[PDB]
């Protein structure tokens, strides 16, 4: 495994193929072309889901293309369809926005265990629960 | 919550100010059928004592001439602007 050469995690909704206003210059900053994030980008995206943001490693080399392994979609984008309210966050402590229980978030927690770091399921359970704590969703334990 | 204190002999305007200009201040102990007792005591202790909330509630044992008198701080006179005490009324 090599050290920091030129890898950066950056791209909007994975369904949005070839983003120029959202990202544009950043993914085409290095020697890698703009076309690479379109054909090869939607190869792995179409398996899981579209209209969903998902990250990937961009370890650029002097050859032409780059090696990559995709990870997992982040916490609250998943807590849209799962949570209910589109507006995640607003004025929680002064005015509670929403609420989620342990049973849903504990079940949602373990599905990312390929990417997630922890000891037990109950360990990352209160983490990926906690991801709700911070959207004005004081966890219904 | 135990303070050594002397008995006053001079008392009035002249004495009290002379006293307060010597790191001390006049207080008084009274209550029950016994007579009131005027009590000179040190400033810098009692200033630090009053920071705690227990001071204005709990029982204090003031040591006078050997004898330990049990009291509660009923009333108190702050100095107008400077952070310092002028006088304390100890109820028995």
């Amino acid at each position: 495994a090599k050290k920091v050469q030129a890898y950066v995690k950056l791209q909007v909704a994975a369904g949005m193929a070839n983003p120029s206003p959202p990202v544009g210059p950043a993914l085409g900053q290095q020697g890698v072309n703009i076309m690479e994030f379109c054909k090869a980008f939607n190869a792995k995206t179409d398996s899981i889901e579209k209209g969903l943001p998902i990250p990937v490693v961009i370890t650029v080399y002097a050859d032409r293309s780059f090696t990559f392994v995709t990870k997992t979609p982040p916490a609250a984008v998943l807590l849209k369809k799962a949570a209910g309210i589109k507006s995640g966050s607003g004025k929680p402590n002064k005015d509670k926005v929403g609420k989620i229980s342990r049973a849903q978030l504990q079940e949602i927690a373990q599905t990312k265990a390929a990417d997630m770091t922890g000891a037990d399921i109950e360990a990352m359970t209160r983490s990926i629960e906690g991801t709700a704590r911070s959207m004005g969703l004081v966890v219904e334990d | 919550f135990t303070i050594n204190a002397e008995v006053r002999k001079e008392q009035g305007k002249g004495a009290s100010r002379r006293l307060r200009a010597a790191n001390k201040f006049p207080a008084i102990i009274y209550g029950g059928k016994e007579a009131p007792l005027a009590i000179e005591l040190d400033h810098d202790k009692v200033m630090n004592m009053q920071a705690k909330a227990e001071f204005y509630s709990e029982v204090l044992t003031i040591v006078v001439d050997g004898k330990e008198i049990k009291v509660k701080a009923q009333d108190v006179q702050r100095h107008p602007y400077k952070p310092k005490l002028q006088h304390i009324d100890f109820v028995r």
Partner: protein, 136 residues
Amino acid sequence: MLQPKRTKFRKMHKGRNRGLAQGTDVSFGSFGLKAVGRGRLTARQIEAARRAMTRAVKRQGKIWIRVFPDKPITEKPLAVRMGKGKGNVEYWVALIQPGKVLYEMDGVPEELAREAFKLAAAKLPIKTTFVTKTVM
């Protein structure tokens, strides 16, 4: 700008601002701005010092104004000789002795209170200090 709503008498003697203050303890709020110095506060200074507090702590918190003017200060116009009547009432002032709590504050942190009272203190002529509500 604070002012009495009707009075018995329009014009008042100059008087002598002496002795110590009476509004000494912090009664309503948790914190307060006590007047160390002696002097007088105009209606304008009070409003100016209120605005400087109110804007610092934002919408949150609660503020009292323990002082109120109720003393009309006359002033003679420019290019006018002495006598021929008492002057006309220009502004309204509260006499401030040492010890007087000016402003009181509640529902804020101690850290953010002190900085709010500094901004007010900078608008006032009198030397002031911070005081906390002590229980008895």
